[PDB]
Design a protein around this ligand. Structure first.
Ligand code: 16E
Ligand code: 16E
Ligand code: RCO
Ligand code: RCO
Ligand code: RCO
Ligand code: RCO
Ligand code: RCO
Ligand code: RCO
Ligand code: NA
Ligand code: NA
Ligand code: ZN
Ligand code: ZN
Lengths: 29, 21, 29, 21, 21, 29, 28, 28, 28, 21, 21, 21
């Protein structure tokens, strides 16, 4: 599970930048 | 879901934007 | 403001860690 | 919302739980 | 330079794309 | 000062995200 | 695999710190 | 103060990179 | 092998958040 | 140490707290 | 204190290395 | 390049100076 955990960390930071003031939900999964 | 899609192969910014509100 | 943009990146990181399998919503308003 | 509540004064990890699903 | 420009006012990912190789 | 320094770290993360496999030149000048 | 994409993010952060005065050129 | 809190996150990452195998103490 | 190095970066950031003003030693 | 433990399996918040002062 | 010294002014990698073990 | 050189094995900060301008 560690690899997936680390990938998810990167993913939510990218989604933060893409979505901006719209925000987003992160829902594992 | 997003982890399955985007940890299998790289998601483009367009693909990521589908997960925004 | 840029400060809030920078704050939000750190907030998302923290929510990812705190919320675990539940996930979270990032709603900056 | 979380920016108003947490971008001036520090929100503890316990307070941040308010924004979990 | 770019840091002054983008740390004074927010730069979008669209704006930043023109700095790519 | 320090503000700028830490903001710049986020800025290069955003450049990295948008540029992807293309990469980018970064200068503070 | 996405490993190299994720590694690059770490590389740029380190380059930002190492190459203070003059920045860096990231070409994967 | 949130600015200090956020600065500390970056300090610990820089220490991680600088100190390598030696590690570090983070004492606010 | 880079994955321990990269994981360690994430781990110290998490420790920073969890330990707060208590601090921590990081010791690989 | 913390790397052998927490880079082989995900350490929870509580498990990480084991390593605070 | 590292926070006082390095959030009030930019610390070089050489200055930060002082805080290593 | 940097990915072949530094995403397989750990590059030290000295090694990373190869990619400064
Ligand atoms: C949580 O996502 C549950 C989802 C789960 N499985 C999947 O979505 C599919 C498997 C994910 C592939 C993970 C590969 C990630 C590679 C990460 C690189 C590891 C090293 C990273 C080092 C670094 O930080 O850069 C399901 O049950 O569907
Ligand atoms: C939206 O536009 C913001 C508008 C604003 N509404 C609020 O600020 C109310 C937000 C909902 C949560 C309020 C719950 C109040 C209970 C306070 C609990 C304090 C306990 C301390 C511990 C902790 O911080 O969790 C508006 O326009 O009205
Ligand atoms: O597919 C991914 C995974 C993580 C970050 C990202 O920008 C894309
Ligand atoms: O109040 C905050 C702001 C940003 C990150 C964090 O952990 C707490
Ligand atoms: O304007 C900026 C500054 C820093 C990061 C970013 O995504 C945008
Ligand atoms: O086990 C781990 C490794 C890295 C970050 C984290 O929150 C937990
Ligand atoms: O002065 C600082 C503060 C935070 C990170 C860093 O590399 C330098
Ligand atoms: O070899 C590497 C890869 C990524 C970051 C770093 O500091 C070193
Ligand atoms: Na981000
Ligand atoms: Na509001
Ligand atoms: Zn920051
Ligand atoms: Zn990573």
């Amino acid at each position: 599970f560690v690899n997936q955990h680390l990938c998810g960390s990167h993913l939510v930071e990218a989604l933060y930048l893409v979505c901006g003031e719209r925000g987003f939900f992160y829902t594992p999964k | 879901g997003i982890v399955e899609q985007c940890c299998t192969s790289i998601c483009s910014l367009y693909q990521l934007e589908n997960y925004c509100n």
